[PDB]
Amino acid sequence: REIVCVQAGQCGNQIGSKFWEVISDEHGVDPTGTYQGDSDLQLERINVYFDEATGGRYVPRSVLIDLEPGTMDSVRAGPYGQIFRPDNFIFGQSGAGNNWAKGHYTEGAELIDSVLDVCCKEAESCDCLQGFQICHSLGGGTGSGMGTLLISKLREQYPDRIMMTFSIIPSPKVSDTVVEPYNTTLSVHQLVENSDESMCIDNEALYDICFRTLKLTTPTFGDLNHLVSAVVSGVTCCLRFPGQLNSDLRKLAVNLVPFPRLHFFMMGFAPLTSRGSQQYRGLSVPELTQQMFDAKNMMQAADPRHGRYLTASALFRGRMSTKEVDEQMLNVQNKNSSYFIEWIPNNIKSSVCDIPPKGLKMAVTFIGNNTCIQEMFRRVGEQFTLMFRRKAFLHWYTGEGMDEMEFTEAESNMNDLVSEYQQYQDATIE
Amino acid sequence: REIVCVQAGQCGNQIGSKFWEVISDEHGVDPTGTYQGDSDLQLERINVYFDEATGGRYVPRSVLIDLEPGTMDSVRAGPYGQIFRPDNFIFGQSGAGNNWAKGHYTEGAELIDSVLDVCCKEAESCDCLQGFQICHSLGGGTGSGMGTLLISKLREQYPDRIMMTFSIIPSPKVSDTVVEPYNTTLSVHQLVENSDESMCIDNEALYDICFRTLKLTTPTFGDLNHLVSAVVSGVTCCLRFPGQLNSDLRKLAVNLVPFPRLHFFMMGFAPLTSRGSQQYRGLSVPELTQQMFDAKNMMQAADPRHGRYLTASALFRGRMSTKEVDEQMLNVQNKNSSYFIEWIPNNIKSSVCDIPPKGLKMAVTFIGNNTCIQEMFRRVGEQFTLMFRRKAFLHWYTGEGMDEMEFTEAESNMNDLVSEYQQYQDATIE
Amino acid sequence: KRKFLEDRARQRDLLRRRRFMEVEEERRWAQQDNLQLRMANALERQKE
Amino acid sequence: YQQSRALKKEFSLPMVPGMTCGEEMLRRSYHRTQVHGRKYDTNTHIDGV
Amino acid sequence: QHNKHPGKTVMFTRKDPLKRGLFSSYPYIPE
Amino acid sequence: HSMDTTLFSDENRIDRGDSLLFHCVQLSQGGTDSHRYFFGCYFPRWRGFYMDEARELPGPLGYNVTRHFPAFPFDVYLKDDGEHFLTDDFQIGSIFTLGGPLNQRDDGQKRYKVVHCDDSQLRTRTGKTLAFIGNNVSGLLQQTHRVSGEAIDALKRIREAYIFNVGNGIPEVGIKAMGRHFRKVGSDGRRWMSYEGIVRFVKDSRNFNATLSFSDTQRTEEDVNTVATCIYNAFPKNEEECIDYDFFMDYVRGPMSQERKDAVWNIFRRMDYDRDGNLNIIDIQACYNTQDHPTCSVDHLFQSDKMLKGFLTIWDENERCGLVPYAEFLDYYNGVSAVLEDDKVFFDVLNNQWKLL
Amino acid sequence: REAICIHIGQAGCQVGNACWELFCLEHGIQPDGAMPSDKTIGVEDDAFNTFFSETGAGKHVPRAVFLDLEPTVVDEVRTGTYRQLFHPEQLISGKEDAANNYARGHYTIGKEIVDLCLDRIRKLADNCTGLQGFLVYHAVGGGTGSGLGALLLERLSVDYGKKSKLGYTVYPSPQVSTAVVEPYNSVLSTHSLLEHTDVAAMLDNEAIYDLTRRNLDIERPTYTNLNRLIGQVVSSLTASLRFDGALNVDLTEFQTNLVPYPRIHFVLTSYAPVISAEKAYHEQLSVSEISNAVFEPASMMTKCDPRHGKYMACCLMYRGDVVPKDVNAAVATIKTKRTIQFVDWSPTGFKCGINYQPPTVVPGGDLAKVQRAVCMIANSTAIAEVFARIDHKFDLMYSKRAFVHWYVGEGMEEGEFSEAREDLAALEKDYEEVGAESADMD
């Protein structure tokens, strides 16, 4: 049961570099690729993310794509950069310019065949292939355009597998790019047709996590990308270690998505402890559950108090009783019953895995499907309508060749997604 | 079972010198002709390419022909030049001038009798004669004209043997000679009637092999001719070493050619991989098959994706299991079924030989009969028609004496070859 | 019966030994290829 | 009972999802080397003979 | 001024939330 | 041309190469270290060699496949005196050490013993005459060392005191309890003796004592301190001032052949169904053979079940958790091997003792 | 004499580990399969035979298959302590799970695997000479347990015919729950269990958690405790085949005495001396006290109260040092009680069995060592309350088609939901009708 990773654009390549550092650390792989680990439990599932090269070595099943190699030169120069296969780096000769149409239509069609050749070579090497995993930002240029292009091609070629994306979405307070509403709207239109499950992260939520919870004096993008790599490596943990109640990506999808358009989820990771307070709170399943539901620990700007939970999932790592997990999930559902959709009798799935991450006694990752996500799309649609009515920057996209009708389709589809969420929020038994 | 080699023109003599270096290395023959090998397996089939001279020495059964001795004087001065029999070098006193008619009619008919006398002496010296093998370029002058003259004479005198050719053909992007379309068209007209099996190589394709796959910083014609000599010595390996499933040139022809005009093949050799990359990918039978079908590893500019495979052959060298070979060839035929002609139930023949080339764990040479070769002939016919309407450079050929009807028949015959390939591509059962 | 059982034990031991020897040969070849690659790289650097 | 020629190997602390400091800011020169568009071999390390 | 997460904490739990450690209990019926 | 040729056989290749394959085991008192297996190869062209570790794990189709990872990567290693490793250093029964651990599976320097050697593809046999085989400076130090006679007399009287007082005239149980305070195994792979441990050891012989008056207690303390000082200074010390347990039992128990150690380890391997270093007391109860013993079958002087209970008594941790480590088993069989002289008697009683499959 | 065990999915394999641990320790087979030749009383002494067969070299191997779609649990068995006990062919594992979808297990993936399982079961059934039933362990809450369990029971029922099939089944608990789609899988499972099982025993984890908290003194229980209790129950029921006793009970006698009508085959199970070692020194444990214990609802392994219904038949298994006169006095005391009621058409409500072998003690276990125990299986109308709550939860979700597109995509008609829900409604009405006192002339 093998996962294939794709890293696209600057954000994607940097997060991927930190992810593969975290994964190589957990399995005890030296940056030369030699296994130096200390338990058989590490070796028996190494195949899930690594392929074996001759006399010891392991290589990571990842494709790196970007339109200008600058980020790739930074990752190759990094401390773990040597592990990556040279043939797996695909690049053009000029940048995306933060423009969706350029990234999708001009350099996209030029590069895409070499990316599909690498992705097929990587997928067909697996003895049994599990879903794909993609990291990119939606506000950028090559991230949005090449991510959605590649996703559409892989969905044509592998329609029976799972398609999973991790995605960075524009903050509500400060933009990093002026033309963000167009790129976001078009990318969400592509995702709602093509994707099976999508996670959304706001950089503002990670900044507030770092400053309030971890009280870091001088955080850097390495810390934010470490938090993301921690949750990403946590969702798959039950795939690759033994446990009392095994779980799988398809089982999460089957339990989380009630209807096929409603596949956008909130993410969190629980055992964040402040730099000077570990003496004040012992580890326990209640403590993890309390942090798990605190909105302070959620990586999106929308708050649960304005919506209702359709479904949620918790994956526990560590040696613990099943009774405490079940009774905690019962107590939280019973005490807060107004925030759970009433025509579903139990919204939370639990799973338990024996092997915690190194240096932590226990950990949990939380995935939540909540209707308050509709507030983000409404805000993006407002900003899109403000820009489009005045043709604010439209000549770039139209000059590349886009039909204006594409923009009205994407707006209508997002507005219908918001309406569908609002209708399911206020549904009743009668 | 003895093969006789013919080397014609500059390209042929240069490739031949490197080929006989490779063969002398594989059988451990010193440049003085003394056997210095380290296994009996080398000696027991030495007769296939060498004759025995007195008190130890071996001499190679090859004829070198050219119209100006410059190349021959360069190869004779080379490090292995002494091995060649002095009486086997035949040369004139003035060049072919890159003109087919000069090479075929004036100096060709002048020299050809001394070449036929040497070839007959060599054929009648064998205890049992296998087919002839000839290396030449089609774009040149003496190579094309005198090579095809000699081919016609040998087919008159030895119609029951095999005729095999390795031939260099003009690149689609840059010409090495201005009058290439005439010489190529007339030579292909001669070959399709006379030849039994013809292999085609683009120098541009070898450049792309070196740059993309091998990443050489400063390649030289010695490297291109080494790749060709490697493949050439690989096709004959099962003739001259033991194995689990023996094969032969006649058996290859019987399995590859469905109808007698369809005898033009694509070539490839698999364990090509750059010195930087080799740490990242181990050799294995799936790996050889993956490289084997990658159009990147094929020595012609036409790509298989625009055509369909009628037949293919793979020759494996080494001690290996038959299960992986047979099941890999089945899996490739089943998964890519649209690229395989559907009215043949199995398109691939396999063969297995115990002895790999020195310093490689495993190797395969691939021969493919694919309809996408029709686009190359169409391109040559287009350029020929462009030149002929304007009578381009025709006075050279007409002044030597050629009738224009040769040009109109050769153009018509190539056009009919393109049409017949196109009809079998789109044929159906009904 | 005792003789048959001890013969079967010896046969099983031989089978296990062969299965180990295969992997040993694999590893030895890998090391040889690595050293060959090292020498080729050194030659290229000197020429440059 | 003395240690022989080969040396002890040291292993670094685990990577907890929190509790990391800004070690990337301790450098004082951030020149970037072009590898992909220029070097055919890239920065592949091959050991000495 | 530092920006803040716009969500306030609502959900609360406790250790050992069940009554006497039992999920449910049957009533007493006399005789 | 035989019918059982593999891919890398010389009959299937033109090129040739030289090498030397070998298998190794680890010399340690730890239970888990006994199950491990290693293999490697030696290249005399560069005088460099590597070594791997082999493990058995379930495969993709269900049956077990073997997996390996480096334990010592390719390098040109040197001895303690700087000389290189020649071909003669990899003979059967050669003990050598290379250096500190290079992975996380070990915690200290360890010794390795070659158990198998193959030279079907070796063409350069190098060897230095009048030289020691392997890297075994500790064994040379033990061979060249000499101990004092009064130390041997002190250990003789101490052994007598344990055999009578701590046992009940049964020498095996007496010798077994003699190494009770030195059960812990260090990162080196061998057990160490401290001076305070030696003082506690000598005091437990129940021989240096008298009436509970103050002067008599002081005299007994002085006597036991003098004896412990005499024993402690007669053996070589390492850093942190400790001596070796194996060299101690070389003069308490005596020399022991390799065959006896192999048979004891084979019994331990058969009885251990997990791959930890512990035995369960229920397995010992089920696999012992009190029933066919002649003192219970033909003489009827002892009862079978009572003698079984008495045998279960002697283990130090039978009433609390029921786990018997490797060191306790080896101590019991050290006593057993010390008691008997002849080889065939030892092997017969060893086979009759346990009714394993 | 012989019985074959079939373990399906995660719960069934994990319960199998505890069962075979217990049966090994009770008979005396070592983990590598070898009796010391002392644990038996002489030659012609064949008690293991119900569960083990010996090879000609004297190794023992057990009469079981392990079925799973994911490798991990079976690979844990392959790498664990009992590696040498099982035959490698017996441990069957697929590549990927049924992802909590009954439709995926039944139609897509189990359909590929079912003939290998049937061939293995055939290889077991050929090595028997008095096979008298199949024991099946599975959970109906998960995808492969429901779908492949149903498909396999259908195939077994066609191929073997009259041979009995007894199921131990983990049903979705009434308020502890682990996955959202549990009601759909449990509803679809129950149709097959209705048609293709002779007696079905129902279990809920919430009841065994309550029992281990209340009676045992365990603050933080886990699934291994529940599995040890299940293993004890199975050992008690099969002890009647394996050891000497005053009143033996063959597996056909259970079906003859306990089942009044062919649809009325769902039974409650309870076990009496669940007690800790520290508690054991404060209390005597007489026959009448444990007989009084098996009738309290705090003793039950399913969350239902039998005081809300009427008993039709009870089967009481006593093992250990018991005398029949004390069993008769106990049963007469139970009969006097006013809160225990039997339907008026069942006057002779009890079947008794008495076996001399006391229950075995497992080294890591949590039960005390006791000289006697009693185990009860009983048929009661109270079970109708369990179906009403599952059916209500199904109706709540299905009113909005909450998840149906997964099931329809993996190959199932929407009609199958309504059919199954109506079949459970008819089963509910059967339990209403059978429990109605007498009749009327008009």
Place this chain on the structure above:
Amino acid sequence: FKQRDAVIGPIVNDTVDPKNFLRTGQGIKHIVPPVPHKKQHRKDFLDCG
């Protein structure tokens, strides 16, 4: 027992045009055709008399 296959890779240059943009409801759906199955109602209905 399936072992890995070999793929030659497709060509998708000419399939991307700005005039053929994605529309609503055009996503790729994998729907397995339904296969009917028989059922066996061996158990008789309740006959309590």
